[PDB]
Design a protein around this ligand. Structure first.
Ligand SMILES: Nc1ncnc2c1ncn2[C@@H]1O[C@H](COP(=O)(O)OP(=O)(O)O)[C@@H](O)[C@H]1O
Length: 323
């Protein structure tokens, strides 16, 4: 017996029977193009292994409110649009701020929005839009807000049943195939609430249907020195059927703004040694970026020439023109 050979032969059958990515080595150096929608976060794109959210798949972005989920979802929509894509937003929360969305580059006018009467209706409308093949991306707001018609209308069986989960099951069971054929990426936003208790009724069916699952979370409030703007987010790719999972990314979303490009450039620039972080100060090839991630953030903002050559250097070192 020759283990490594016997193994590849197994993995081969494993994948052929259940799909590419059925099994893989955490340390894999992946080489499949696989059309993506840039998360709006460079770090998150790399963490995903394919440079963004896979197209034609079900994506779940779960986490506590205010952790950055909708922002990513919105940045994704903006990116799909820029590539001449058509986006749809199934809204069951009534929270979306189109203004903030425009700010993230979303063309709100061409954005389809639906505000369903019941959970059923909501997924059914999503399913219809999907199989028309016209959509590149479709975001469903709040997994939990997809409450069953029967619950919406007064219907007390004292204890009723576990219907909403089945609602998300049967719905994903028939949508996935269409998404695959259509190539539309379905992002489900899962707002986790209530202090204590990866799921929200349908998030249990979502757990198995998703090809990518993002654990978004707020880990820090950004500052100067008691000055704030917005917080830093940490995302954990807990499920990745297209690349080795369990990776992580971080980024800053300043208040009123989306993901800070410059921030990502400083972060990755340092960890990838392109920019030199000497204690309090930041430097890029002799040039002083300033003392304080913010000043450096600002510096990079003003000197667009730098940043771009830095972005270039980081981009090259990682994801370049493949195939
Ligand atoms: N409508 C808005 N106006 C200004 N800033 C916003 C707005 N929505 C979101 N933000 C910024 O994005 C951050 C994350 O918000 P969001 O991603 O919508 O929360 P969630 O994780 O529940 O989807 C907010 O803390 C804020 O920094």
């Amino acid at each position: 017996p020759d283990r490594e050979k016997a193994l590849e032969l197994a993995m081969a059958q494993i994948d052929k029977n259940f799909g590419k990515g059925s099994v893989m080595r955490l340390g894999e150096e992946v080489r499949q193009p696989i059309s993506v929608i840039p998360t709006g976060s460079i770090s998150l794109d790399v963490a995903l292994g394919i440079g963004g959210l896979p197209r034609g798949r079900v994506i779940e972005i779960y986490g506590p409110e205010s952790s950055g989920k909708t922002t990513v979802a919105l940045h994704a929509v903006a990116n799909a649009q820029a590539a001449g894509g058509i986006a749809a937003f199934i809204d069951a929360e009534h929270a979306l701020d189109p203004e903030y969305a425009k700010k993230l580059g979303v063309d709100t006018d061409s954005l389809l929005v639906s505000q369903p009467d019941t959970g059923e209706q909501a997924l059914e409308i999503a399913d219809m839009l999907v199989r028309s093949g016209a959509l590149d991306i479709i975001v469903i707001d709040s997994v939990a807000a997809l409450v069953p018609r029967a619950e919406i209308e007064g219907e007390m069986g004292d204890s009723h049943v576990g219907l909403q989960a089945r609602l998300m099951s049967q719905a994903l069971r028939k949508m996935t195939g269409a998404l695959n054929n259509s190539g539309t990426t379905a992002i489900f936003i899962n707002q986790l609430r209530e202090k204590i208790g990866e799921t929200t009724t349908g998030g249990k069916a979502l757990k198995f249907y998703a090809s990518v699952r993002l654990d978004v979370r707020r880990i820090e409030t950004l500052k100067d020195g008691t000055d704030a703007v917005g917080n830093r987010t940490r995302v954990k790719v807990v499920k990745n059927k297209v690349s080795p999972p369990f990776k992580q990314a971080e980024f800053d979303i300043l208040y009123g703004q989306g993901i800070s490009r410059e921030g990502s450039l400083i972060d990755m620039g340092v960890e990838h040694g392109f920019i030199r972080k000497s204690g309090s100060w930041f430097t890029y090839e002799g040039e002083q970026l300033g003392q304080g991630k913010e000043n450096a953030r600002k510096f990079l903002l003003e000197n667009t020439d730098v940043a771009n050559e830095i972005e270039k250097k980081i981009k090259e070192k990682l994801g370049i023109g493949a195939v």
